[PDB]
Design a protein around this ligand. Structure first.
Ligand SMILES: CC(C)c1ccccc1[C@@H]1CCCN1C1CC2(CCN(c3ccc(C(=O)NS(=O)(=O)c4ccc(NC[C@H]5CC[C@](C)(O)CC5)c([N+](=O)[O-])c4)c(Oc4cnc5[nH]ccc5c4)c3)CC2)C1
Length: 138
């Protein structure tokens, strides 16, 4: 369930920053490992991105859509899906930081929709989430 993967990821990301969120564990565990590694490898770029998110209630949807479209423009791979999760999380953290916490539920929806609509076919073709665990899990 791609929704579950999103919800579990946002709860983990928000927890990292001291915030709670009211709304096969090995997939969730391997994703936490991968997003952590990605965030370390791209720490300073993520600092710049967050400083430039300029989140507003009526621009957030387009900001999300433009970044994720560009991200997967050249094709899909597991690293890009990991980057997708970490971007969404950085947006969720910035929404809470800017007293815009209602946007978190929206981001969770947008992420789940994209996963189910534009990423599921590639995931299923390249082995499923089990292949992600085989490649980068324990
Ligand atoms: C802020 C900015 C940076 C940004 C973020 C999000 C969206 C957009 C952006 C920006 C805005 C405009 C431009 N845009 C950037 C341009 C851009 C640069 C980054 N780029 C990409 C695209 C693909 C890969 C790529 O290597 N894929 S991979 O070969 O499939 C692949 C290789 C390794 C792993 N894990 C290894 C595993 C982890 C867990 C451990 C430690 O326990 C064991 C080892 C995974 N894996 O899925 O786990 C997949 C990549 O490198 C890494 C390097 N190491 C990584 N570790 C986790 C993810 C990951 C990705 C960077 C995508 C394109 C993004």
């Amino acid at each position: 369930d791609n929704r579950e993967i999103v919800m579990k990821y946002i709860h983990y990301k928000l927890s990292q920053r001291g915030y709670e969120w009211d709304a096969s564990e090995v997939v969730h565990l391997t994703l936490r490992q991968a997003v952590d590694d990605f965030s370390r490898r791209y720490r300073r770029d993520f600092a710049e991105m967050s400083s430039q998110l300029h989140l507003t209630p009526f621009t957030a949807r387009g900001r999300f859509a433009t970044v994720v479209e560009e991200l997967f423009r050249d094709g899909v791979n597991w690293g890009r899906i990991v980057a997708f999760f970490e971007f969404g999380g950085v947006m969720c953290v910035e929404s809470v930081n800017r007293e815009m916490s209602p946007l978190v539920d929206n981001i969770a929806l947008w992420m789940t929709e994209y996963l189910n609509r534009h990423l599921h076919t590639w995931i299923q073709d390249n082995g499923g989430w089990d292949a992600f665990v085989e490649l980068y899990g324990p």
